[PDB]
Ligand SMILES: N#CC[C@H](NC(=O)c1c[nH]c(/C=C/C(=O)N2CCCC2)c1-c1ccc(Cl)cc1F)c1ccc(F)c(Cl)c1
């Protein structure tokens with residue numbers, strides 16, 4: 124895969140830039156950029172200009188997820204309460220609900236009517252409308268205690284992976300524990316609905332057998348392109364930039380290695396657009412020994 128840098132966004136009216144995460148708007152107009160002070164900046168991709176600034180947190184934004192319908196946004200931050208929140212993005216920018224001690228959140232996938240939050244080894248499922256906690260998912264007997272566990276729904280919303288344990292949501296119980304082969308990473312569902320990727324191990328969802336071991340995915344966070352044909356993986360720094368300077372691409376259909384991309388700067392986040400046209404990467408432009416970070420967003424043609 125080739126990645127041509129075409130633009131750079133820098134926190135305007137500032138000496139050093141403080142972006143920490145990125146997501147493309149559900150409709151193609153904006154790049155949403157979270158900052159190290161807890162703001163969310165909306166940049167017009169075409170004009171290159173900031174058009175809005177929203178107040179979300181009082182510490183660095185760690186995670187952004189826009190709903191597909193364009194109406195809602197999840198955020199997470201690093202140490203200020205609430206650690207996660209849900210925002211409405213219609214006429215007014217509103218906090219709809221917060222998830223005060225959950226340090227990571229995602230939407231449900233099939234129908235975006237729920238949020239799943241993670242607090243340590245525990246998952247919480249919330250109703251978007253009421254904000255009420257519907258489920259708590261934790262089994263002390265099956266737990267892997269992954270240090271960087273993040274809970275997630277599968278594509279049809281009927282299963283959750285939490286701490287390497289598969290849960291049936293409708294009957295609220297664990298159905299399988301995947302064996303523990305690392306200390307940190309808890310895994311994700313492939314958008315195809317057929318595999319679960321837990322660190323270096325690719326598991327078959329139908330039979331639960333190990334299909335592949337991919338050493339290059341060790342300690343990686345993973346994201347797919349819109350059509351689910353390319354998987355991006357970047358290795359976390361040992362637990363400050365969350366990643367090192369490289370990410371790798373794989374063909375999502377057979378896991379075939381594509382490319383290693385080293386931008387020679389530490390990476391804070393990576394996001395893809397809906398049209399498979401652009402990749403945005405938050406990169407520390409600052410020198411190795413600089414006292415302060417200078418994290419910009421670089422836009423790449425895919
Ligand atoms: N969403 C999304 C995209 C996803 N981003 C992250 O995973 C991500 C992006 N950022 C933080 C964390 C900041 C953080 O802790 N900070 C930043 C400022 C101070 C502390 C995390 C992150 C790290 C650990 C955990 Cl277990 C989960 C997290 F979401 C990603 C997927 C593939 C990739 F190739 C890349 Cl480069 C990124």
Ligand code: NA
Nearest residue numbers: 375376377378
């Ligand atoms: Na496949």
